[PDB]
Structure 1
Amino acid sequence: MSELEKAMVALIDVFHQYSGREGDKHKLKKSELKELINNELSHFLEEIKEQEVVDKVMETLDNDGDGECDFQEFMAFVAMVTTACHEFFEH
């Protein structure tokens, strides 16, 4: 596999690692999303410690209003973070 292919596999893997913990196995509830950010995005995002921030993150990502983050919504989140990373080598 190429580096790009390996990256795509890692996205699927980490999503499912967290989504499969509780409830709907194909979606992230707030606690699953919080843990994914805190454990897996610690170099790119400040740790989430406040319920208000958990709530705002889910509200931002949950485009279909079901209170959870599905795979498409997670990929949109990945796109936003990856876009923000540009500041640290271009702008």
Structure 2
Amino acid sequence: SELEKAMVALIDVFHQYSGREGDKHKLKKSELKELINNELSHFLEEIKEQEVVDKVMETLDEDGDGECDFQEFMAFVSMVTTACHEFFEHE
């Protein structure tokens, strides 16, 4: 039942960077950039340009309000989780 301890980690990750600065209730592309670069520094995604962030936000911030809600940010993990899984092939 790892999803049990892992879920606690995701709930803490939500407040770990979301309440770091700005509005803790909603995530702005600037705060999300820190989330992507602070949790995925050089493990798989390296952020150095706003274009990645801008393209990544259109993927979550499908509202275009330049903001990402907890539900929208949670989906980003799934997209990276799906891509990371692809790293493992048949071998």
Query: Do they fold alike, i.e. is TM over 0.5?
Result: yes
Tell me the C-alpha RMSD between the 2 structures: 1.8
Q: How many residues align?
A: 90
> Corresponding residue for 1:85?
84
Q: Is the 8 A contact 2:41 2:47 kept in 1?
A: no
Relative to total residues, which structure has the larger strand share, 1 or 2? 2
TM-score by length of 1: 0.82
Q: Is the 8 A contact 1:20 1:27 kept in 2?
A: no
Deviation at 1:43, TM superposition (A): 5.0
Deviation at 1:74, TM superposition (A): 1.1
Residues 5-64 of structure 1, C-alpha deviation per residue, up to 9 Å, x if partnerless?
Answer: 111111111121111123321222122111111121135433110122222211221123
TM-score by length of 2: 0.82
List gaps (5 residues or longer) in structure 2.
none
List gaps (5 residues or longer) in structure 1.
none
> Corresponding residue for 1:76?
75
Identity of aligned residues (%): 98
